[model samples]
Structure formats: C-alpha cells, structure tokens
Target chain A: TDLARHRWLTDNSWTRPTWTVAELEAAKAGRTISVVLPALNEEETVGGVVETIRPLLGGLVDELIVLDSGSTDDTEIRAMAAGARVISREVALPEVAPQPGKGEVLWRSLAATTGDIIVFIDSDLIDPDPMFVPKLVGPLLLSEGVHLVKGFYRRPLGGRVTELVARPLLAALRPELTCVLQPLGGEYAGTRELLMSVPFAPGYGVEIGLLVDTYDRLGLDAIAQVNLGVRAHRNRPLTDLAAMSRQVIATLFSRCGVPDSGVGLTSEVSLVDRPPMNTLRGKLAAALEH
Target chain B: DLTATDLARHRWLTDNSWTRPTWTVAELEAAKAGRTISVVLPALNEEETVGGVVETIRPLLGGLVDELIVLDSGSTDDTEIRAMAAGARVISREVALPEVAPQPGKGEVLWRSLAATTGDIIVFIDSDLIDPDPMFVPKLVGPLLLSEGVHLVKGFYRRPGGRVTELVARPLLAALRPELTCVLQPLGGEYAGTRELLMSVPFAPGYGVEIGLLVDTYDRLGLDAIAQVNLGVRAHRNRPLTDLAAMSRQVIATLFSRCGVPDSGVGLTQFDRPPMNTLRGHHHHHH
Candidate 1:
C-alpha cells in the first residue's frame, strides 16, 4: 500500500525542479494554458494573487481569469485592475442559474477559458507563488496518464481544516488519497476534460469532491502531486472550520455510499482520526467515542 | 515582542523546522572539516531491527560518522553477535568498561557508549526502530554541527508519533514545561547532543532517561540552544500497550520529581536533589 506512496513522495514531493521557464516552454508543446483564481470578497488577498501570476501570462500561459462569487468587497475592482479578466458567477454561467458558493465559480470557469487545460487557485493565499502555475500544470502538459495534479506544500500556515477533519476522514475511507499531504487543499489544477466530467460539490466540499470523483473516474495513475513549499494564509476561526467540516463530511459520506449520512454529522461528535491542533486530548476523546 | 515570541514559537512547529535544509551529502562534506559525529545504539534484546539500523547508516561511516558502536545491555539473545555481524563495534554491557559497575538500564549503556565512542557529536538512535531513515543521522547531527548555539537536536518524524508521545509525554510537557510544549516529539529516542552536554548532564538511569535528559538540558541551555528537525515518520516495533505501565510510571516520576509547575492552578513542589549544580559534580554531590 505504501509502495506507491513512497515512490510518489521520493520523486514528487520537494521544492526544486520547479518546472523551469525553459523546461515549461518545452513541456507546453504549444498546448494552450488557462489559469483561474476563485475569489469571494477576498479584498485582503485577491490583488496580490492577481499580480503574482502576471509573469506567466505571456508565453506558457494563454489566459489569466478570475471568477468572482458576489464579493461585497473591492475584490472585483482590485482583481480587475491587477490584470485578470474578472467576471461574476452570474455573468459566467447565466444560461444556467448562478449559485453562491466557490464551487459555482470553479465550474463556471470551464466556460470562461479557451485553453485546453484550466488551472484553479484560491485567491485567499497569503504568499501566492507565481511559479505555482507551471509546477501544477507541468505534469499535465508533459505526461500522458496524468489528468490531475494537486498542489501540496508545507502549510506551516495552519491548515486547520486539513489536520482536524479532512485527513482523518480520508485516512479511514480513502487511504490512497492519504498520501497527498494536504488532502483537501484548495490549491490545485486539472485538465479541462477531467474537471468538467465530474460534479463539483457546493462551497468548501469542492476539493474533496474533485479528489474522490477523479480517482473514482480515472484511477490512481491519473493523479499526480507536486510540492509548492510554504503556504502562509489567513487562519480561519474555529466556527468557520466547523461549518467547513459539515460540507466536507457530507460530501465524503455521499461519495462513500452512505449518501445523506452527513445529515446528522457533527464535527464535534464525528469520528476523528487525526489529533487536534497542538494537543492530543481531542483525538483521545474521539478515539474512545465508539 | 509578544508577536515576535509567537512567530519564533510558530517556527518551532513541524513545517517550518522542516523548512530547514536537511543533512544531505553537502553536510557530510562539511562535517569532515568541522565537527566529527558518532552514531550510538543502546541495545538490549533487539536482535530483529538492530541489523537494519546498523546497515542503514553504514555508508556514512568515517565521513559523516566517525564510529558506529552498539552497547549491548546483557541481551541473552544474539544481539551482540548480530550487531557485530551487521558491522558495528559491539561492546557487551558486562565488559563495556570493566572498572565501572554496570547498571541494568538503558541509561547505563548510553553512558558507557560515551566513553567507548570518539566523536565531538554523539547521536543516540534506538535499535528497535521499525522504520529507520539513514537520512535521520545527517538530518539530526547536521544542525548541531552548523549552529554554534544549538547544543542538542531532537528528531521529530513527519508522520504521527506513537501512543506514549501523544498521550503521556505531551501531557507531561504541558504540565511541567509548558513553554517547551512546542516540542513535537519530546520522548523520541533518536536525538543528538554535543559530547560536552552529554558528559555534563546526569543520566536518569531508567525508563525516565528521556524526560530527565530533556529537562536537565532545557534548564541549562534554554530554548534557543535546542533545535528539533522533522525526521518524518519513524515506525516503532508494535508492542501492545500492556507494557506501558512501567514507562508511564517512570515518566510520571520524572515530572513530579522535577517539581512540575502546572499550566494553571495548584502545582507540585517536591524536593528531589540539591539544586542541579552546573552539569558537573558527580561524586561531590552524590551523597
């Protein structure tokens, strides 16, 4: 079981060999590339994300777009002036009624892109690396079996949702997915054919949904992971994390055959497989629950 | 300054410490000119994994590690023979140093290895490790070599640690050394220290050896002098939890014996020793 993981980690997880500019040019092979950032009133973080990927827009990357989800803040204006082609979810998929969650924007991005592959990144990252684009898309452009690539990193930036909820749940049910360090990380990229073939869950459940469904659709060989190094982002409050846990658990249960089991799922009472932040007390209580 | 302390402590966490470049081939080249390092294993009846432990780090001998010695603790099993066969300088407990009385504890074997080995830096890794990474040797000893102030380097693996660490060691640390609560693997067996620090500090002489050394060093050196590297998940030989009673008792004893001040509310203030004088004074303070 760990054989594949050891093989992947030995080759895939690290900071260097960052799909170099010339290397990416060779890998590109004239295939069009589109980069998308899903923004939701992330006024504090959206502009920096917009400006970082500006260097990749010319040659290797074909289009840079931002799909806004009804941000009440200056995210729209900030993302626009910083050189992204910004459009709201309502305008993105008007033929189909627009939704509110980040998933809606991500799905709507399929129509906004003209490139063969679409890359999605969270706009709320603290130190958004411009190189994240090429490293993520590098495998897709180069390899044949690879249909998706998850952007992994040293989330010294407190990946609360990952440590508390996603990791434990996935470990028990989705052991293959456990090899990827940050299981339900928001920062990732996928080919257009693969991204559009599956259904994207509403809001925070999007990453997990994509992961399980893609592996289910394309098998383990289709997925590849890359290390992006450090990610320092805005740490979410516990209350928000609790809500995110609901979205994630419900999606997992439905996908794992216990459809709608998330109806009674409570992160506070749910089966926890990983230790809580900085202490083992929470996992201790959780382990003895059932 | 509150924010400064917060960031520093945060940096002490798993991922940032992992950000510190590991002890690779580059470190091996530098150590030849800088500080010489030795890897020691205190073996009892660990005939199973001892060979693998010795075989894993055998390549770095004479370059990164000056010597690889295994001090067998009277194992009735084939530990001595196996260790020798596995390419280690095996010294039996009964004859480690014929002049001194051999005690029946890991600390005794560890203390004896100090005399047997010849290196400026000494790395003590457990012989019974189920998954030992050879990189753990350079990764741990590398920091102690490059940094002037960092006297000890504790290895914390990338994966979730064993049962005792999360349940016992961490809880005791929170009660006794809350400031040092940032330590990921407080009771991990694979760690490195300067020969000076190891020689000066008193050995706990029982299962309580880990906590005792850490507390004594933390008192003498302060936080800045100690560094922990993310060695990534080390696998332990899966023994049932039934044997944990003695280990837990010893750890508990060390905590109370240290006059552990709790995180809040009431605390224990038991008198153990005449205030630990400099990491020196063996027989003068013995009585």
Candidate 2:
C-alpha cells in the first residue's frame, strides 16, 4: 500500500496529493518526519509561519523544531509557546560551537532532530503557498534516486537583486544550474543521509554551497526543484546586498578552490583592514578556543 | 502678540511650541529645550504610497520634529529608494535590532523603531495610508505638545473610499469604546505619543496592533489623557472577510489578553494551518 501510494504521488502531476486520512494514518505508523527552522529574532513572521504550518502535522508530518540564535525579544518564547520545539542553536550543538550564521543552525539541527527526513525552511517566507511542503517532499517519496528537493517559486517577493544579481553570477559560473530557478533559495528538503554527507558553509552562501556540492558529488539529477506558486519574504536593500554578495562570492569561490581576495570573512572584520595585518588572527584563534 | 485670526491661519501651529516667537532663532533653540521628536513610518512594500507620505509630513514637521525615520520591513519594491529620496532616514528593522532581527509584522517594525531612534516623542504612521493632508502631523502631535499630562494622541478619521472601513471598523469602534464615540476612526494608523509611552506598551505583533494600543493606553492613561484627533482622510487597503477575520483574531487576542480574559486556548485553533514538511524529515507545524 505504501509503495502503491508512493508510485501514485510520483506519477501524478498535481501539486497537492489526493491522500485520505486513512493513508496519512497508515503513513504515521512509521517514524514521523519533522521540519526545523533556524531563526534569529524573526518574531513578526515566525508566529504566522508556525501557525500556518502547524495543522499539516496531525495526519502528515509529526514535529516542528525551531533552533533560535539568542533572540532578545519574545522570539524564543513566542516560537516555543506556539507549539514549536524551540532550542537555542548554541545549546543544541555545544560540540560544534555553532557559529552565528543560519548555516550553523541548520547544520546543528541534524544532530538534534529525530525525523526520518528533515526539512529546513526559511522563517521569513510570507504568504507561503499551501503546497510548499507537498511539492518539496512528494517527489522524494515517489521517485527513485532523488535524495534532495529544493523549493522554486513564482514571483518571489522583495526586489530585483536575486533575479538580476545572484542569477546572472550563477549563470556565468555554472550555466548547468540555470534551470534551478531561485538557486539561492534557503528553503529545501533532504534525507538525513544526504544532508550529513554535505559540508555546510556558515553564512548566506550556505544555499549556494549546498547546490554546488550536491550537484558535484551526487550529480544534478539527484536534485529537483519544486514549483511553489509565490513566495513573499524580506528583500535586502542595495547597500545591504553588498554584504550578501561578498558572502555568496566567498562561498562559491571557496568551493571552486579560488584563493581569498583579501576580503574579511566575519562581520566584525573591518573592510579597512588590509591583508597580512593579522587583524582577525586573535578572533579566529578565540573562535577555535571554543 | 498674534491675533486669534493669525493663530488660526498659522501653518507653524503644529510646531512644538506655538508660543515661541515666529522666525526667531531663540524660539528654535527653545524648541530644542524640550524632548526631541522622531517620526517613523514602518513601511513594507508600499512604494506607491510611501514617497508621498514622507514628502508631505517632512516639510510640515521638518523643523518641529527632530528626525524623520523610515523603518523599512524589507520592502521588495522601490520603497527604500523612494523613501530615502523623500528625505527620510531609512533603516531596516533588522539592522536596528540585529539581536532580535525583524519579523513579518508591522508590530515588529514599530517595536524596533524604539531601538533605532532616540527621541522624546516618537510618532508612527503607516506607509500605505494615503493622500495625507499637511495637518495630519500637527493634529496627531498637537495634543501631546499642548498638554503635559497627555501621553498618547490617536487619530480618528472619516472613512475615505473603502467599503470595509465604512461597514466594519467604524461600527466596531463605535460599539466597543463608546466614550470614544466621538472618535470616528480609532484604528487609524496615524498617531503620535511620547517615546516613554511607546517603549512601555507591548505591541500587537500584527494587524490588530492599533486596537490593542488604544485599549492598553486607555486602560493605563485613562480616556482623558488619550485624545483622538480628526484626520480628514485615511485611505487604506479594503480588507476582505478572511483578512478581516484574521485581523479580528489578533485584535481580539490582544484586547482579551489585556482585559484579563482567560485563555481558552482559542488562539491555537484560530492559528491552525497545514504543516510544511521537507524531504529530509523536518516538518513545520503552526505554533
């Protein structure tokens, strides 16, 4: 019955599957799947995201986890009180000494979560289409040799930077990835086995790193991008885009074996500091101490 | 000495001190004696309307208000560019409170505005509010300046060109707080208050924040200390029933929470939506 249902999902082109309550109940007999959100002070959208994703759990997914980076506001409290298993990313991964980036939180999530398949979602998604989950996970369950599924969407909210800046850069470097629309999208679903194999970068470049490494090691066919209708999230201003650009470029270049261009890696590293000064030497040493 | 007619015709009445000698540098310096005023517009994807709102308010209150801040909630459109071009100090809510970062609600922006600014009085105006008359700023801020006892002044407006405002919001406000019966539009986003009051209040994290603010302020400061001014026109999105229902839930939650209404765990049922799961095994269910 499970095999038959999986085949139907794979063969069908519909976005939402026609699963009855009984089939969901049957699926729940196995170990339940859970989704994790690595959040840092995202109170405004967190509640809504939690609220929107909660009802899908009763018959389908089993758990929701939010790994927060020391939020001063009610972010941790709000996410926890909202029914999410909220844990401080630092506390969960005390061994790794989790860094201050989204990647650190996501990488650590693997150790903390108990789900058979783990889904990582960006917390800032506004008005996320109802089919976001079904589309991402359906193919993985239905098809063979598919280990990773990334979310692609229509009319992403915010501005032209993702389309104009990020897309062009990726197109030039890795034209093969051009078909994967919204390549930098943070939202993706993957099996625990595949996730543990990949080395996660520690910043905005995490998304790009995942795509490049996954394509290089597992081949592009192993990955599929599901089409969500539209995704609304915050867009960075042009001035803010500079930092994102640097992180993205750094990650891509690191993966490509390009040497550092003398740019700072951390936010505290000043842009004015020239190379060979060892300005960040103390900080890097201190980071290793933990 | 100015005649009553001159005072009535004065464009500078909205200035922090009406008694300050007009065009005198001393009055300007004396205006600085009191608390600095900062006006922030918490904008999100409102490029079409933000520029005009900034331009209109800036000129009228430029000298009076110490700073004009535009706190952008990650607008995808030209909202940041346009708001900056209109002479407003633009900053993202995330940048202001990097520790807290920004959430997807107006309340998040409003709460962070306190951290972004250092002012005696902070006035928050919604970006999508349209065709704001020059008097909007003065009317909102006038009460606070004239009376030392007043902490907050919310705007009341005539519903302009919207079905939901006429049928729903206006009637609801009328029934709920009848003493505010004179207040035509209590939920109007344009309002002014001392920074003291703003930082103290727990903001509604979403659509119902305005109503929540009104109830909280009235309960703490009393109705007399909270005045409602008549802003001529307030154009906003005409909410559909579903949107209104969600908004009403937040509003009701905020109000009931303050009124000591016992939590029946009704909010959990209201927030129930489908969960989002990924292939690897992580599932995101509602909080």
Candidate 3:
C-alpha cells in the first residue's frame, strides 16, 4: 500500500524539468561519472553512440567504455575509432568470465570502471543524443537520496511483450511497482554503491530485478524515472520474442521464489534455467566459519 | 500403444496441417468421397464474436463443411438473431432433438448437434472467438480427411492472453490424464471427429466436453486415433479469474466424475468420481 502511494506522475517519481548539462555537472560534484554501453555485435550504432556522448566524457562523465562480449563484427574498431575505449569481456572482469546476458556484462562493468556512478545505455540506439544521456543520469547527480534513475520513454519500439506478459504479470503479482512505466527498458543509471549491494540477474531478467530490489531495499522514493524520447531499437520476431518472454517469466518466478516444481507453470512457456541473485555477491565475500 | 517419444513426434503438428486436399473449398468437395463434413457452433450470448465467425467460414458450407450450424443453447442476447443473419442454419438445442431431453451444458448442445446435422464428420467450434481465423475450419477439418486413422483432431494454437489453460486445464491433465498430458491446448474450444466415433462415447456436461471427449475417445479409439492441428494464434475474450475458477471446478467435476474418489467444496467444491459403468449410466441424463 505504501509503495502504491508513490503513484506514476508524482513529482517525486517522474519530473520533466529541463535538466541542463551545467546543472548535471555541478550536481555530479567530483563524485565522478561513467557511462557503460553493454555491447555485443552492436557495431551498427556503436560508432555514433560514442560520437553523441563525447561532450559528456570530459564534463559530466569522467569515463566511458564499450564492454563488448566477443562481437564477431567491428564493434571494437567502431567504438575505439569513435574515441571511446572498448574492452573485451575478459579484460573487464578477469576474476570470472562474463556470461551471455545484459546483466552479466553490467555486473562485470562495476569492477572494470573507476567511476562512482554509471549510466547504462543500449548501444543499439540509432539516434543517440547528447541531451538524452544527461537527462537519464542527471537525477542521480541531483538527488542525494535517489539511488537509481531508470529511463522510460515513448519507446516507439518497446512494450508489446511488456503489455501482454510483463505488465499483466506484474500487475497481478508486484502491484507496487506497476506505477513505473517501461519496466524492461534497457537503459538506466544507478550508483556503484547500490549496484554492488543488489544482485544482477544473469539474463534479460536484470531490468525487472533492479526495480524490484531497489523497491524492496530502498523504498519507492529511492527509485526515480526519466523520459528519453523514442529510444527505438531492433524489433524481435515471434520466435525471439517467445524466447525472451520465457526468460522474463522465469526471472519473475524465480524472483518471487517459485520452485522448479511450482504448478500453474506456463504450458506455453518453457522453464529457463538461470540461477537467482541469492548469495551472488556473498560468494566472493570470503569464507565463513564452516 | 504410443510411446512418449512417439507422442512428441506426432502429438502436435504445427500450422500447415489442414491445407491438404480436404481443405480448400474446391479441394474438400472433390476429395471426401461420399462422407460429408458438418461444423457446429455451440453458442450462447456471444452476439459480439459469433457474427464474424459465421461470415468468415460461410464459404465452407458449399464444399469444405457440407453443413455449418449454430446450435443455440438458450441465448438471452442477440446471438441467436445475429448468427442466423450471418447465414448459418441456426437451431435451438431443445428444438434440435425434442424427443430426447436437452441437458444444460456446452457438451449438451454439442451432443445434440450430432443428431441435428447430416455430416459423417462433425467439427464443434465455440462461438465466442473474438479473434477467429476464417481458415480455422479447414485447419481443424483437414487431418481427418487426409490421414488414414486419426479419429479425433483437437485444435491447438498460441494463446497470447488467457491463463485458464495454463492454470487449470494443464495442471489437471498433467495429473489425471498423463497420456493426454502430451496434448497442449487440451481444453481448446474447437475440435473435430468422425460422427460414428462421437456417437459411440458419452458426452460430458458443459465445458468439460473437450477434456471428457478426449479421455473417452482415447479409451474408446486408442491414442493413435487422436491428433492435434495448430491453428496458430488463438486470441479470444478472456474469462474473469472468478469464472475460470468456476470453469475449473465444473471441468474437474466432469473429469473426476468418471474415475476416482474425491472430497471437497466451499465456494470450493466436490470432485465426485464414479465407475465407468455408472458414469456411462448417466448418458441418459445428458440426452
């Protein structure tokens, strides 16, 4: 009930105030900022993506990296040639190899970058704007209490699956966070402090997990949303969408602590085997009194 | 006996299943020697979607389905008037087989549809399909004409919205009818069968008809005689969660009505199971 009270369009929850670059830089205030684009075979837009945010590299953002996970294409050359350092998966987190998920690369990026704050942007955005990056990351810089600022938008290319599967499932199950639009939008920004404390889902489930963990751990006020107009990307065919929906439902089930034998399981959707974020960070936290 | 491997191998065949010669209007007429095919819609107050289905499959009457019927189960809405307006031979269930008493259920209407129509092959489609395909008729009726021995062909499709099948129909199948567990969309609305085979078994009461028919047919005709045709995406009006729970209960009452003992009911209720003879003994009640 308390969480539901933080309704959508509440001034605290969403604000359309013109977040100028100067205000962002001032609020950032020596905290140091980085933008991480988790890229894999995203050579199509990697060049221009770096080219768009080059202004922020020296000002609001102190570091920018294309964390590529073995792209067969010239994603590396494009990002590096666009004056952005592109690092391979092994180089980022040499301790343990990165896995085949958005969250896998994201969790590893924390170790590879030196910034206290990181803003994640999808490398596939065709029209990456300099202003869009500022708007997304500015809330975190401005509000000391705000732990995470997730990006939401008109999403000319988003939410068909979200509306059909994700939205209804969440509405039925996690009603509190239903106020947040575009729960699965790929781009977001959060402090390294918050990122390390919460677990990252090993796959597409990462976006939902972040909002949920933030809500559960830090309450409604800690999380905020921003508008980034028309962050259009690729459209998936049904087969690919089916696979994606299967993952998302699996992640939601696992997050809600549904066991493998749970009845009422989708006859249409097959079980995707990805371990939940339990004991994830604790695994590296040194031995206990065994 | 069909092994688990064979069930997976042939349990479900996707989309292009019914496009065979027994499909297209011209093809179906020329292929099926003397055996005629009839399609029935067991309808109620489905005034919204019924009209569209009638118009969509109207072409089937000339050849593919020799008779297309709308068996009205005492509708209070414009369903009766609209279905007739769309060019189907609309008949009320009580009026269809007046000599025999009419039971109140979807299965009751469907069972009576058998006595009403004149096809050697019978296909029963639910009338409330908000997102129906005109090709739904040929896809459902194809395998029966083309294949040598498939006795019952249940329709399977991608469910974009509803959860009853996921929540109710499936878990029940996984438990009781493990052989039928291989069947996806087990409670799917549209289905077809040979008229001789349909008359041979007892019809259940209400929505349980789909499952009851499947189980009894598997018992009477054996597993190899059953097949499923994928109609691709089936987007229909979803029932409320409360309605689904009630549907589940009624379906369970019919499903367990045939075999085992049960103890239950509240708002929750009983799952009363009787022996095969006593169950078939209730056949007169259906008529």
Candidate 4:
C-alpha cells in the first residue's frame, strides 16, 4: 500500500485492541513500568497529579518519576510530598546543563527512569482522568509492534486558541493524522527504547515534532490516539495565543523544512546578550582560565 | 475661523481626535486650588511593589492633591498589609460598601473607587509600578489641573519595559490610534481624571478598562478636556503571551462595543454567569 493510503487505513480504522488487567499483570511479572510527568511551575496541580498516579505504583506501574525544569513555584516540594520520585533536570544531566524547555525534561526523563514502558502526562491537567494511564499503556502491553500510543481527548482543554488555531494548523500540515483527535494533546505512552532513538525538538514544538518523527520512522500503524474526555486548564488570551501560534508555527515550519515561510516565523535558537552569573558568588563570571 | 474649543467640541464625536495643550505653573496652581485631587491605585497581589509606590507618591503629594486611596480587590497576598504599612488608606471593595459585592476586575475596582472616593479629580496608577518618578504624580495631575474645562489627562511614557509591550502593544497602537501618534506610550498605566466624568462613564473589566474609560469619557465630556502627559519611564510586569491575549480581547471588546461594532463572531463563547467550572472535585467542608 502507498504511505498515505496505509496512513488512512491504519489511523482512521484502527480500534484499540482490548487487554485485561490480568494480561498486563502477567506481562509485568518481571519487567518494570514507569509513569513520568513533565512539569514546569505546575505547583497548583502537581501534587494531586502525583498522588492520583502514585497509586498505580501499588501493583500496576513499577515507578513514578517527575522530571521537572527548575520550577520556581512549589511544584518540586508538592510532587515530592505526594510521594513522587522527583528528579530536577539539572541534577539528572549535570554534564549537558539541562536546557529550559519541556522537551529537555522529557529527554532527561528517559535517563531518570528505568522501565519497559513510559507514560507522559502534562502537570497542568486538572482532574486528569485516571483512565489516561491505563488506556495509553493497555494497547502497548497487549499488542505487538505498537511501540507508540498518543492520548487523544474529547474536548480541547487548555485554551480556546488551541482548539480554534493549533489543531487546524496541525490538520493542514499532517492530514493523515487528522483522524487522531487532539494532535497537540500532550499526553502519551511509548517505549523508552523508541523515545531514546527519536531526536526530540527542544521547545514547544516537541509534541508535533514527536508525532511527525515517530510516524516517519515507525510507520502510521505504530501510533494510535485514545480518547481521554475533558481536560481542564487555564486559557490564554488573544495576545498570548499569538505568541504560542508563533512558536507552534515556527516548530511546524522547521520540521517541514519549509525555508523562508514568513507566517509565524521565529529563529530556532535565541542568543542571550547578558553575561552569565555565578549564583554561588553572587556576581557575573568570566570564563575559567586553564 | 473656528476657535480651538469649537473644533475640539466637534471632534469629540470622532475617536482619537483630542489634542493636549500647553499650560503654565501658575495656571496649574490656580486650577489645583479649585479642584479636589484623589490618587487611586488598583492593586492585585502586588505586596512587593505596592509599598514603594505608596511611600514615594505620599510624600510628594502637594496641595495639588486631596486624597490617596488604594482600592483592593481580594488580594490573597500581603498587598493590603504593605499598602497600609506605606500609609495608603487601604479600602477593600467588600468592606467599603457592604451592600454591593465586589467583582473580579480592574474596571470593577475603578468603578467602586469612584463610588467610595470623593474627589473633584481622580488619578489612577497601577500598583505593580516601580521607581514611580515623583514627577509622574504631578505630571498627570498638572494637565487636568491647569485647564478649566479639562476632565481627562492620560499619562504616556517612553516604552513599556517588557518584551510583549516593545514587540506587540506599541506597534498595534501605532496602527490603530495613529492621530494620537505623538503620545509615545498610549498604554501607560498612569492616568488622571475628574470624578464627574468617571461617575458618568461605564467601565469594562480587565484590559478593556483604560480604552473603555477613554472612549466613554471622551464621548460624554468631549476632547477639549482630554490631555496627555509625557512621563519618562513607567515599569510593570511584562505579562506573558497568554495574559496579553486576554488583555487584547478585553481591549478589542471595549473598542468595538463603543464603536457600535457587533461581535466579530470569531472565537467568542457565551456564558450567563462564570463560564469556567471551578469545581475541581475537591470542596472544603468546614466543621
């Protein structure tokens, strides 16, 4: 079959193959299962999210890791208090000096966790339906060659702009994955092996970048998005939406290799004009002499 | 030849038709003696910044101003404590008038401030501002104080000290309100006005408050009374992209509503009360 024809048949007609908890338990007899939450300044929702998913560690998931990116808020403390194995991005990869982005946290999470399967959930999701973890992982555990599964949703939660703008843009770019509702939906479960092999984008474009890259490497049949109903979170106003749209478009355009497209364009890398400071000494630092 | 006053009166019907006039210190002092001055700051959780703002402006208040009030709208932080610590007469929207409940917005605070405050002239400075050049208080007040018929004096500044302001707001304003092009910073938070004009005009919530206030005040009071002050630098939080969008929506709504423009039927959603479902499955039960 042609790539586009196979994409349509596999994504649109694909029904989630059912697997029982017993079968998951049997498969997990010796192997470890881990749940990873990528968070940034999500103090308000992190604690509840950690606690809700921590119970899965009882017998279902072997480990729960929170990969955080220098949250100034109480996100770290709250996640720790809720019994999550929290690892700061800086601590996990001191050599690389963890970059400030969600993708950095996700990339660092692979090293921080030791599991056969890793499920990633956004920290800001309020009332994150507990079914999200089981649904994403259920397909991978039961079926063969189903290396990646993305979480789809009934409603576009975060903001009106995501529903009105981001989704439409994604549809235009990748029409094959259009049937997979909520392409920008941040929740997903995939093998740690698959994630490490994939080259992830370092910023807001990580979600779309992952979908496109994974589809190219593993074929459309390897990916499936399950419906998780109603995600609730804060909405961005029109001006903020413009900035987000810029980032989303920038990431989308870069991945597509469409050079010179002026629509919502921005540089991939931003340069810092200020001198680097040594916080330990409380002053600007010069390069170390050999 | 038509006089400036005749032209100003006629131009009142058109948006952005107001012109600022030059005034002497003697004329300012004479007008100040006749007009009652009240300074108002609409504060949220700005405890860190509010104290400094109040302290700097309090000592600088000459016979030109009568009262300085910090109108608070349920600040969860120590904003009230710091404002009061800095000698600002802290008045909570709920306590000031027990009968009418306070709403969650800057416009609500400004409207309630007008009801609670008794001033011939009112000046509003956002609480999050830093290094509030003592000159700002007098600069905004000077224009309104000098002219006998002037009811509104907008404080325009050099640039908004944040990324969003530098990149977005300035360019947008330059495109939209070109006639007021000389007023370098149109979205500057500091503005002074008369109580009579405020009481008559309706205020919208959030970012729409300033634009709505200007449009409504001009519609009722006319352009002859409006003036713009050039304050060197005004600083505040550089709201994130998300926040700017919310502010933009409120601003667009205010402008279009006044202009008799119908809803663009774009990304608008309708709700009778609060649209967001605040119930997050956890409700505190008091014993």
iRMSD per prediction, in order: 17.7, 25.5, 9.9, 10.9
Candidate 2 RMSD to the correct structure? 22.7
Could you tell me which residue pairs clash in candidate 4? A237-B245, A237-B246, A238-B245, A239-B245, A240-B241, A240-B242, A240-B245, B150-B225
Q: By lDDT, who's the top model here?
A: 3
| Chain A only TM-scores, each candidate in turn | 0.85, 0.78, 0.86, 0.79
Q: What is the C-alpha lDDT profile of model 4 across A24-76, one tens digit per residue?
A: 77776465678989988999999888887776776778888888888899998
How much does each candidate deviate from the true structure in C-alpha RMSD? Answer: 19.3, 22.7, 9.7, 18.8
Q: Write the per-residue lDDT of candidate 2 for residues B70-109, one digit (tens) a residue.
A: 9999889999999989989999987777765456787778
- In model 2, the runs with Cα more than 4 Å from the true position are A1-31, A156-159, A262-290, B1-287
Tens digits of lDDT, candidate 1, A20-51 = 86787777765778889998879998889989
Tens digits of lDDT, candidate 4, B95-188: 6556566668887787777766777778899898777766667777775665457677787665452433323333223223322323334455
lDDT of 4 at A96: 62
Task: Name the better of 2 and 3 by lDDT.
Answer: 3
In order of appearance, the predictions have TM-scores of 0.47, 0.43, 0.63, 0.45
By TM-score, how accurate is candidate 2?
A: 0.43
Q: Best candidate, TM-score-wise?
A: 3
What CAPRI grade goes to candidate 2?
Answer: incorrect
Taking chain A of candidate 4, what TM-score results?
A: 0.79
Better of 1 and 2 by DockQ: 1
Best by DockQ: 3
